[PDB]
Amino acid sequence: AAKDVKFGNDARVKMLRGVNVLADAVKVTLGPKGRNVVLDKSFGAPTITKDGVSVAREIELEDKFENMGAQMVKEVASKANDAAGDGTTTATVLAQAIITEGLKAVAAGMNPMDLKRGIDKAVTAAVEELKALSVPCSDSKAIAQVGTISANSDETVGKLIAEAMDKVGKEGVITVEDGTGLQDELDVVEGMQFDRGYLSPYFINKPETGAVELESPFILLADKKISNIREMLPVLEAVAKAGKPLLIIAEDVEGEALATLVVNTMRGIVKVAAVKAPGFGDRRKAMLQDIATLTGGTVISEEIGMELEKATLEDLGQAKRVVINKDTTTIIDGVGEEAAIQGRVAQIRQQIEEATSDYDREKLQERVAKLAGGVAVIKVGAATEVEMKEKKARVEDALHATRAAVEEGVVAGGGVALIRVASKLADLRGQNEDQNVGIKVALRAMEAPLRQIVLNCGEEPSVVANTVKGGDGNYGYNAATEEYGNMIDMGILDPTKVTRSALQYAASVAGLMITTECMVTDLP
Amino acid sequence: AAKDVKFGNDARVKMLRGVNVLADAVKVTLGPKGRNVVLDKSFGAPTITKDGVSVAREIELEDKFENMGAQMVKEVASKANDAAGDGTTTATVLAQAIITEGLKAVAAGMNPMDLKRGIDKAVTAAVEELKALSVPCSDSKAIAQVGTISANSDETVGKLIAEAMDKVGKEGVITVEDGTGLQDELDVVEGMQFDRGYLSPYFINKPETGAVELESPFILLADKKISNIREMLPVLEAVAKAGKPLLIIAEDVEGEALATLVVNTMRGIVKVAAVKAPGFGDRRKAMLQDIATLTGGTVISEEIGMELEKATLEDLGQAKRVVINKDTTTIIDGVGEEAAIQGRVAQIRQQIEEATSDYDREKLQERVAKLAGGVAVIKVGAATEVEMKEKKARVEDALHATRAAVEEGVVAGGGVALIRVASKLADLRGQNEDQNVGIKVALRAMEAPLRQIVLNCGEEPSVVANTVKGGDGNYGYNAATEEYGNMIDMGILDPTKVTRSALQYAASVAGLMITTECMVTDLP
Amino acid sequence: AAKDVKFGNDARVKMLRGVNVLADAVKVTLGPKGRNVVLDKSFGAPTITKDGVSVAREIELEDKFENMGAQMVKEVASKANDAAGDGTTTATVLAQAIITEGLKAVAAGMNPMDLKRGIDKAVTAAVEELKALSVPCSDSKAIAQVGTISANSDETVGKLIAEAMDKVGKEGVITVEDGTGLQDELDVVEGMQFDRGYLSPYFINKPETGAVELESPFILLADKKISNIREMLPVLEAVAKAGKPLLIIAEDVEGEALATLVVNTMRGIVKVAAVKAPGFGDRRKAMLQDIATLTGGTVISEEIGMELEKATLEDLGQAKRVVINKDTTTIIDGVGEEAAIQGRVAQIRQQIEEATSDYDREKLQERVAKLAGGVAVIKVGAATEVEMKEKKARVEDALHATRAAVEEGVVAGGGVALIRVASKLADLRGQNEDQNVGIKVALRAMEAPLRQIVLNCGEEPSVVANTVKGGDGNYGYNAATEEYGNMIDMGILDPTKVTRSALQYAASVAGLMITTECMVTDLP
């Protein structure tokens, strides 16, 4: 349809007003003194959130050009959430500061492209400075401190996250789910377990817990489903001579096939149990191959050119104990050789390194943890559902921050690392005056997060920032206690990855935001 | 529906208003000091562009007559983008200038038809002058300079394009894709490769990389659908006796044959691999015949009168190595004799000669490059999506400009080539006074791009144009450095093809536009 | 729906307003100094046009009565375009002048029926006067002049059409088609050609052109679909011993039959090619019989009671060369009897004069040109689509004008033939005073086109018309150079057919529109 075109200062002020609206909506949730934001939801009750990305994703203005500004700024929060999982409010604040100072400099008669180049150069130097400033985070105390800081100063959440990380190990999967009680709950599963239960309720040998328990059993791996007992007689007869229990993991077992098995279990001849293989497609084949590798057995498949009738005792895997419930089964202490286990984990790690999809990487990481490692689930507890949602979001943020800190490292929190980086970049110079102006704009905008934190606390940001810059090292401001001191002793830690990603994304968006000249959009 | 008719000066002023609106929307993105334009998209985030055609393609006015004028002018940018891929803003500016002075002269009582004839004569002379003024562009230095200039003065992308063209050669295709990292990288593949992986994951003999590699194998090319092995018994026996491995390129293989093939592969008797047939239909047959010619083999087809069971060792091709991944298959160092390859490439280029579209042109050119030459891909790296899109657009513009410069040549940049051409045609005459007026209109509008560039830089276009016209040869004005000098020495080049096409299309549209008398359109 | 009725002067005034609106929209494109008109199109870009019928087809007013007036006038241009293909603006101008003067006479108190009768009598006299004034047009110079004049004074298109008509002959087909280059191109076809190509890509023996080249082959014509090879053995064996190639024309051949033909061609036993029978229905059989007559063979048809197994070498035609492409097939120098060809074309033409439809005739002249003569295609070249459309329209107008001039003859152009005719009828009288008034109205309205041309040129029409009327013979006014002289000497020629058609249709519509009393239409 018809379009509307504005040129120059009018377009710039409209875009700046939209950016300011979105930034004012988002930035009030920064720091330990930040407050909540109520987001209307058509499908249900309103949600109370303190996340920057959650607030940003809903802002949408009536004016078209202000909408341009808001939708162009939302990218900073979206990218910072996708990349690191934490630090979106800081990215939005930095983007707003850079946009404001850049527009003010452009209004003074400067070339926007040279300002963009200077900003890019300053950020490139600052990233290296931040990498230099980083310190490794290895002890559990530092991980607990990071988890506490990233969960709105919650000691219990950080302690639980640190304990889960210690229990699971360096390679593992930790997830969060809503609970049923009033307090947080952590459970860890050691070994391999997949959510497939017994097929017939008559396999249970102990109704005390409603579970099927076998000691030192044989493991039969078969991709094809069992339709007739014709293929099952030789292996059953061979196993019956030994007396050890047997476990069947096939695609499916029909009623008549399992009737013979249950009858034989009742008559005391053999002890067998039938469950289904986990997953569909090639995923199920991969799971069954992993099971065979872990249990020291061999998968019997029709596509490879072997028959179930030809199976012997060699093709059957072994385990120390197998427990099957109505919904879950577990195999503990498999007898599979360790060398094959490390080969499999190495191969799947190389497969991960070439996987660019979040779902695939998550599935393969769960695979690696289940094959060798551990899986933990954290059950958060809250009386009400809105409190449930908010606590779950905080715990997810803490988990992501702890993972990032373990990956790369930790710097002083509270916006002090950025202040130090900007302090030791005062001799940076460009090619002409405009590039120097852009460099100075970036350096001055690097101070925004600490000023906003102190403003949220309720003090004078200018004097606090001045006296923080007056010191050196890890000297900072404790927002909670409203006193100065070393920011490492007080336990206020910030991951390097989060700060670096926030700075890079904010600068990248704001540099393009600066150079806009005219906007075209639909008519009102 | 009811129509509205306007006669004469009212229609002319409405058309000029629409032309001015569209031209002013597009014109702010000309030169190295040009600024960006943000475009509204209802599906997703707004896009920020510097391309003239991208800006002009969405401009649409509410008033019907101004809208028709905008639709007239938009065709100049559309055709200049489709023909050469670069130089759309210059074409739009030239068209706007020619329209302006044409209507100004028409308002003085001149005959529009004679003005159009004079403009056509002037442009016809100018094309010959530009062809005479061109200089060859062969070395990599000039290619790098052209790529840098065409990409908003970015040295890295120009150097990357130059060395990629050097690596691929004179007969090859270079494309661009969205990368994942933060830095620009080039990937080049030599030989033949089609995006068809293995048929069964059991063919892998090198699980370290998750791929199967073959050493000096035979290649079997079959059009038929393989479902039973009985036709493959003779060729399988022959290659088992020979000892060298085998590769199957067939339309598809069912599991009955795959089971036998994988059994024989794991048993260590023969080494075989099966892949699908790339392409669909006539293109698939053409590519398979290309593979056969490259490897010195013969295609076995059911419609040609040959059966796979009668194939011998002479019907199997040979190659030094074959690399098959999960997704791609690579054949390197074929055995086919060179004269057959030359004949095939000549034939396919001959079929290229009669290509009526770009869709088949790109596919046939890729086929030619795959037969002889190389294929390279450039993956642009940016933190955010908008930066990625803008960088990709700039890289594509640089690629098109380098291709055009290789095709025809280069002239002095900065819009001074048109100034030299116009100063060389000061003695052109027509048959009457109106034709002379049209010739002078074209010659005076020849100076628009340089004046627009200087105006965008913030200086006075009149003084700079007077100084440039007072020079000789390649004397010009450097917009970035704000200094005068030899523009070939300074490294500012534009292809002759781009300027010639822009001038031709702008004149062609404007000459028709200035002769209009009345407009008819639907009522509001 | 409810209607609105207006009586007498109000209805006549509204009708005249609509007529004036449409005529003023149309008449600005008359003469060599006429300008363009741009027509808004909802789908795509608006079109620059100079045709009277194209402009008239779009005008429709909001007011119902003026809309009816415009719709009644539009039929003059529609019929003039449909009949002769040229001279529609002149018809519209004549109709408007006659309507104006007739309405003035009716308002003065005359009887409309007698005015209509007098107009018809005057036009009947004028038609025979024009037939008396006509002179033959046979030489190529006159055809070139007519083509130049009819194409807005373009020498190149006139010369191209003259040479194309000379090369093709007196009975041929010439069509226009969008070109690729920047210059016009003429493509003439020698021999017979039908739009059908090879069925299987394996018959190709000359990859230099991607086509087959058979030297002195036999032609086998079979009406029935070939699906079994058993019938093919006798004639194939007979032609195998001869050594000459063979071509098969059938409605369709199934791949089972193509397989053995391809194998034989590869092995060098017989050089055969197969193409489909062009067309569908009775015309397919008719022109296949024409193929048989040209090649000197007999159609093997199941409908006649002749079977394919009994065919011999007498039933196969011969030709000097046969060339088949991906889409076309040509028979060069078909051996046949000249008398048979003349008889066949005589039969086809005597069918032609019995054709009562325009669509059903053009195929007949195409067949005549295919049997005897040739066809030509003229490619128009233009940089931009709009210029291509306008140039194609001008070329089509020139083609139609040249055809009409060859058909009937030429008279002095510039609107002076009508002036001479009106001056010859100065003594015509009717039965009463009213019929004399109508005759005078027609005679005075016959001079409108020259006045309109002079007005478009920008001069005083009255003095120029007075000077022209004062001369004799072909004395006229040259609008391009603005000087009087001999019309035939300057080469300004108009066909008699277009002038007669325009006059007749304009009078036929205007006389009927004059006699309106009341008009009834829907309410707004």
Ligand SMILES: Nc1ncnc2c1ncn2[C@@H]1O[C@H](COP(=O)(O)OP(=O)(O)O)[C@@H](O)[C@H]1O
């Ligand atoms: N007690 C404290 N004293 C000073 N600064 C703090 C304290 N606790 C947290 N901070 C700082 O406040 C910031 C909290 O940001 P947050 O509200 O989680 O938004 P986001 O993590 O999305 O940027 C952290 O960067 C941290 O450095």
Ligand SMILES: Nc1ncnc2c1ncn2[C@@H]1O[C@H](COP(=O)(O)OP(=O)(O)O)[C@@H](O)[C@H]1O
């Ligand atoms: N440093 C420079 N000094 C002077 N002129 C330049 C310089 N860089 C580019 N130009 C000129 O500016 C033009 C850039 O056009 P651009 O904005 O890319 O639009 P388009 O290429 O679509 O016409 C080129 O034609 C080039 O001649």
Ligand SMILES: Nc1ncnc2c1ncn2[C@@H]1O[C@H](COP(=O)(O)OP(=O)(O)O)[C@@H](O)[C@H]1O
């Ligand atoms: N050079 C000329 N001098 C005088 N009259 C001309 C000249 N060229 C063309 N004409 C006249 O002008 C008329 C052109 O009509 P045109 O605008 O083509 O509309 P149409 O052919 O549809 O009636 C012709 O009838 C011709 O007689």
Ligand code: BEF
């Ligand atoms: F603002 Be982030 F989600 F801590």
Ligand code: BEF
């Ligand atoms: F302005 Be063009 F797209 F380089």
Ligand code: BEF
């Ligand atoms: F306007 Be006509 F068709 F020459």
Ligand SMILES: [K+]
């Ligand atoms: K927050």
Ligand SMILES: [K+]
């Ligand atoms: K541009």
Ligand SMILES: [K+]
């Ligand atoms: K006309």
Ligand SMILES: [Mg+2]
């Ligand atoms: Mg946080």
Ligand SMILES: [Mg+2]
């Ligand atoms: Mg460019």
Ligand SMILES: [Mg+2]
């Ligand atoms: Mg005409």
